[PDB]
Structure formats: C-alpha cells, structure tokens
Symmetry: C2
Subunit: 148 residues, 2 copies
C-alpha cells in the first residue's frame, strides 16, 4: 500500500497533463507534455521514483503498459508495472473526480500564470496542501510508518 | 529545520543542473536547464514547494535572491527567501562535495541514457536511495516527526 501509485492522463488547452497519484493518500505529482508518449511517461516515472519509494505503478493505458521505454524505466527504477484496470470500480470515478477537481483549481489560478505548466504546478501545490490532514501530510505519515 | 532547503547550481556538458537540497537529510531534487535564469529558478521552486513543505530557501546567488520572478514564486508558495551565505562555513564544503558526488554518479550512469536530463534523474534516484538510513528515509522521518 505505501508504494502504490496510479498514472492518469488528462487533457487541457490542447496539451496533456500527466499525473501520478499516491493511491493511499491522494498526493499527486504532475507535468505538462505535448502528448503522451512512452518516452515522456518513462521519464516521468524515473523522476517520480527518485523522489518517493515507488514499488508498484498502475499504468494508465495499454500503450504505456506495452512501451519498451516504460518497461525499461520500470526495470531501472525497481518498479513493478501493473495494469490500471479498476477491478474495484470506484477507482475510475475517483480519478475522474480528481481530474475534474484539478481542472477546477487550474481554472482558479490560470490567470496568475502565463503558461499552463505553471498553473498545473500551482494546482499540484493547492491539491497537496488542502486539509484533519492534507495529502502531503498523509503520504509522509504512511511512508514513515512503513519505514519503521 | 524540517522546512529548510538550499539551492545549488552546477555545470556539466555546457548545461546547468539546478539542485535543491533538504539540509537536514541530504535529500535532493534536481533538473537540467539551459542556463540559470530567475524564471527557471522560480518555476523549480514552485514545483518543489508543491511536493514538500518548503518553509525557507537559501538561494544560491544574489541574482536569484534579487529576481522579481523568484520573489513572486516565494510569495505565492509561502516560502521565506534567505541568502545562501554560509556564516557556518562547513556548509559550502558540503555542497561542493555533493556536486562532486553527483557528477560522479552521473558519469557512472551516463552511458545508460541518451540525454543528460535522464542521467541527472538516475543520479537523483541513486543519491536519495543510498543508505543506517537513506536520504529519502531521513526526510520522511524528519517531516513526519514535525507534523506531530
Ligand atoms: C530507462 C533507461 C535505462 C533507458 C531509457 C531509454 N533510452 C535508451 O534506451 C537509450 C540508452 C542508451 N543510449 C540511448 C538510448 C532512458 C530514457 C528514458 C526516457 C527518456 C529519455 C531517456 C534517455 O535515453 O535519455 O530521454 C527522455 O525521455
Ligand atoms: C509566481 C507567479 C505568481 C508568477 C510567475 C511569473 N509570471 C507573471 O508574473 C505573470 C503573471 C500573469 N501573466 C503573465 C505573467 C509565474 C511563472 C513563474 C515561472 C515561470 C513561469 C511563470 C508563468 O507566468 O507561467 O513560466 C515558466 O517559468
Ligand atoms: Cl526514495
Ligand atoms: Cl506539501
């Protein structure tokens, strides 16, 4: 549980927002890319795994699951790649809700930044800090408890 | 102490590596940029602060300290900007050693990636995971203890 993350890809302003959600806490990391490719997903995972102890990743679609570059990055970083098939079906709805919510925050900050990428990072900040505990507090507690 | 970070800028392959070090743990985040501008530093800080509870940043030089964009980002994210003047003089030597160490790791992984940015992220991973606790474990413990 402490090492489980879910990939999520959403669209805005003709661009792609790639999101990694720490399932147990709701904590996110996100980036803007021109389009989802195996290479971009692989690089994103390498960054993520150097920052948090990523054990398992539920990939967001079959193309990324299949991608030889994504597979290489998961091998390199010691990540077990799994499908993102929501056998538990509330999972989809939770991600759907998060995308809607992230887009709402992006709209609220949008005019404070020229570039979408900046607005996305502001939205990540607001999401992770919103409180009772915040997502940022929850992920730290979960992992700290796991270490010990 | 749990919220104190230090900026560090180093050069390799004609490019700039921007590093943020969590002083109490030795944990790092890093990115490759073409050159160190206020805008790049500001964006880097926005990303950092959405991911970890950044209270104080010791900026790496006077241009970034002065930068109106860096100041804007610190205001937005609730970061106290301080100078990076090592009144305590072992500080500079610790950063020097870290840059040398990071460059060593980059050399060790360099041939496994086409692009410098990828090698830097591999180096971040190795640095943060190296154990007795790792930097990644230490930062989580420090912040978890602080929350309580
Ligand atoms: C996971 C590692 C082991 C391999 C991948 C794929 N690279 C190769 O197969 C390769 C190895 C050696 N020489 C050339 C290519 C690295 C990678 C992933 C994602 C990226 C990248 C890179 C990159 O190569 O910089 O660039 C931006 O997005
Ligand atoms: C910290 C926030 C409040 C302000 C900065 C500076 N921007 C403005 O002053 C501005 C505000 C409104 N319309 C246009 C410009 C945002 C920022 C920081 C770093 C970056 C950026 C941006 C960006 O504007 O996207 O782009 C890549 O590196
Ligand atoms: Cl880690
Ligand atoms: Cl946070």
């Amino acid at each position: 549980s402490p090492g489980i993350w879910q990939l999520d890809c959403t669209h805005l302003e003709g661009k792609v927002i790639l999101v990694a959600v720490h399932v147990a806490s709701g904590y996110i990391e996100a980036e803007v890319i021109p389009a989802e490719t195996g290479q971009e997903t692989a690089y994103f995972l390498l960054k993520l795994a150097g920052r948090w102890p990523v054990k398992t990743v539920h990939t967001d679609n079959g193309s990324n699951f299949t991608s030889t570059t994504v597979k290489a990055a998961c091998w390199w970083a010691g990540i077990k790649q799994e499908d993102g098939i929501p056998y538990n079906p509330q999972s989809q709805g939770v991600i759907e809700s998060m995308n809607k919510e992230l887009k709402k925050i992006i709209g609220q900050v949008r005019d404070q930044a020229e570039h979408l990428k900046t607005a996305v990072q502001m939205a990540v900040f607001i999401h992770n800090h919103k409180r009772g505990y915040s997502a940022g507090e929850r992920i730290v507690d979960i992992i700290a408890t796991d270490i010990q």
